[PDB]
Design a protein that fits this description.
part of a larger assembly, 3 chains, about 325 residues, alpha+beta, four-stranded mixed beta sheet, 9 helices, 13 strands, DNA-binding, structural protein/rna/dna, Nuclease
DNA sequence: ACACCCTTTCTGGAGCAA
DNA sequence: CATCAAGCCTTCCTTCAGGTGTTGCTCCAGAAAGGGTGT
């Protein structure tokens, strides 16, 4: 089953790339040493072979959300919105290992090297949730394959293929957003501002005195840590139309129905990260099932046999498969 | 819960963008070198994708207030207007670290590399203020999600939803506003204007000769600079979002929104730059704002009323307590 | 606390907008080159989002005086006849750096990066003058928030918040006023007017020869220029906001507003521009202004009368003192 | 009864570059 | 209805933040002996 979810982020996208990146105040990424630089936390970037100029494929940077992040977003969406309410409305409860296996593929960091029986493998791949995300102590193949969230851009034209010339994007799609943390105690202004503080003016003056001592120590170092922190993070600019490729090799109809229910409940979900700055908010503007567009304003339109299958399976959903899926053979 | 606080700024909005940007005496932003240049401190602006050629969408600038700035504004009006009167009214006094953890995210720049217990996580995410704003030494996630203040503009037409198209403004929304600082010794002009000056005439003469020696070869008070601002009267929008909130947390947000009328947005405090009025507040798509404040949402106001009653310092203390 | 000072300019207003703008003899601001352009210093203009037609908001020009000019003007009137008399009737001697920091917010152009102690911050924000205007070497935040002087105009309709539905000026509020400088000795006539010039006719004839050599090909004299001014007789609006003031500070601002009529708003000093009367002062919405100054707000006046007594130089000295 | 299936059971070393 | 005026100076940024914690892999890559039991 081929599912293609074209979304539109209405907030910036921030999937933080690991690394030690810096930036000048003017906006130059990774400056040579000597000039003053601030920590930059770049967004996640996929190198893509693309056609720059004419017939000259080259590796260009295109900033994305990883398929692991979107796979866990899909997993936690169908978990918080479908699977957990189905378990709550009945008497079924999960162990902490079963909850850990359902949310992160495993209960412990150490798997057991023995694989499970063919009957249990077949029944877990027939399961609506466990078939999508087959983890556990004995590693199963989950039939859900989740691609990265690619922005519909020229740099991904060898990724996107034909049919994506509408709402086209060129050029840079990222922006460095600067964030500052000020010291609260420097923003104290009067005795009315300080009355909620134990000690008041004495404690405030002690905070200024420790900041002056630490500043003198840092000046002796240059020529603990305070609360001033001016820094930067690169985000992907809002308003982009993104492609999200979801694949299912011979799924049970309830499993693709569960993916459809999760895509229905992607409303009020954040894609990558930067929670407190409301980053990752998005609007789905299209879902195509095997190339057939099945999205409307009121969620998924059509595809009814998937929804009846997943409703019947959620009615038949229990905690027994989750418990014996997470049960280690070595334990 | 999805709140849309659509506001209109009375005065020019100035959130100072980082960078050594420059301006000529005309309206040329960042000129080529070899011409007379002045330091320009531009407004904070966000690139947004917008339909510019009626088929082609492109990354265009749009001057905003950052969601960090508006989040700290909401946090500070909650603290100085709701939380601190409830704390000093009941006699509760936070520690200096607890005050720093209330106004910033924590008290120290080094967070603890341990996770807190689930009982603690549940108590603070059920707490109104600490549930809205996480952080601390052990990296709590708040339930509040604060977007940038976006102007209702055709550059943001892919950013806003529906119903804003009749209000959507086109064209440039900024101004290079010029400021200057005199050396006020040059403005003295009289021998009875130096009787307040110690030394008097000889002191004013020494300041003049020091300025002349500095100009012949420390920085004086003569400054001429510029800052780009968003134009006043612009209609904005502010997307506050709530990840599974308690009704007390929503009531704390609405209590903050009721008394942001005397609060300033971003920078320009001496120029009264941050002044604004709230045109509307949509509470999950339903309008709850009027002239007197937020009407309706009564369960949220009652929940934050019973939550502000019994608000103790010890929750902030063991939120700020390191490990 | 919100103060709304509604003034009406008696003479034209000229706050010169920076920029080499040009004018033709029949109007046509900033023409294409070759139509004999004349130098034009336009008055200060703020772009304001405004209703241009039914359902369309555009960034229109609106001629204002910037809030920095108003902030320094308020600082200067309190310094000129409330603060300096309080220092020299008591014999207090401000330093020259203290005078610089009082009249301009700083003594030098290099603020200290170190923060001041909280007791110092509390004393200066509780100070009547230093609380209004902060700054200094360690960058104090003042309690005063001075808006720019908008006119009562329909272009400012989104600025005023529909407080005044009458007296709304619709058309343009500006005139290009032309000023020319005559060469003095081009109008002598007789040799009795040149007998005071040393040498007599020979020095004026040498100056005429130098002017001729300049005209065939060093700057001359008798230039022709234009300056856009706001037309007189219209009604303005001023907003002076306060960040939790002591009543001595409110009394200081009202004492500035009482004898505000002696000073000028920006202007050309020679042309007597910037003259104005105050038609009203709104203290948080209630009118406290009459023909005989300010009537009402008595506790602010008693507080500022208490604070002017005992106002020593010592606070100014350790406000301007740089670490 | 002879075929596949499901379990145990069992002996030794140990350093490591790109 | 024609020119003559058809700017001049000077400002032309200041300090500071200029990251913190964690993560820092897991497992298995055998074949026979000795029991069952299912066709």
């Amino acid at each position: 089953m081929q599912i293609e979810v074209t979304v539109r982020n209405i907030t910036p996208i921030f999937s933080a790339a690991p690394g030690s990146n810096y930036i000048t105040i003017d906006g130059t990424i990774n400056p040579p040493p000597g000039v003053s630089r601030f920590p930059l936390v770049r967004t996640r970037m996929m190198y893509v072979a693309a056609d720059v100029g004419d017939g000259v494929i080259k590796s260009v940077p295109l900033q994305i959300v990883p398929g692991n992040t979107m796979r866990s977003l899909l997993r936690r969406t169908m978990l918080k919105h479908v699977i957990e309410p189905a378990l709550v409305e009945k008497g079924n409860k999960l162990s902490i290992g079963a909850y850990a296996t359902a949310y992160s593929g495993n209960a412990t960091g150490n798997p057991d090297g023995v694989p499970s029986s063919f009957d249990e493998i077949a029944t877990m791949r027939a399961h609506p949730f466990i078939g999508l995300f087959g983890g556990g102590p004995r590693m199963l193949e989950g039939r859900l394959m989740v691609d990265s969230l690619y922005p519909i851009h020229t740099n991904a034209e060898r990724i996107l293929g034909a049919g994506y010339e509408n709402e086209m994007m060129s050029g840079p799609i990222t922006q460095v957003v600067w964030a500052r943390r000020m010291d609260p105690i420097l923003n104290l202004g009067s005795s009315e501002d300080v009355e909620v503080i134990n000690g008041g003016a004495v404690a405030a003056n002690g905070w200024i005195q420790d900041l002056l001592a630490n500043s003198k120590a840092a000046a002796s170092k240059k020529k603990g840590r305070g609360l001033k922190a001016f820094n930067a993070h690169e985000v992907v600019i809002p308003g982009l139309k993104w492609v999200w490729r979801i694949s299912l090799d011979r799924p049970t109809d309830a499993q693709v129905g569960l993916v459809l229910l999760a895509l229905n409940k992607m409303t009020n979900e954040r894609i990558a990260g930067g929670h407190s700055k409301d980053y990752g908010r998005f609007v789905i503007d299209g879902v195509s099932l095997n190339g057939e567009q099945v999205w409307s304003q009121s969620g998924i339109t059509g595809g009814e046999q998937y929804f009846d299958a997943v409703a019947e399976a959620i009615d038949g959903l229990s905690s027994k498969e989750f418990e014996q899926f997470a049960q280690s053979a070595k334990e």
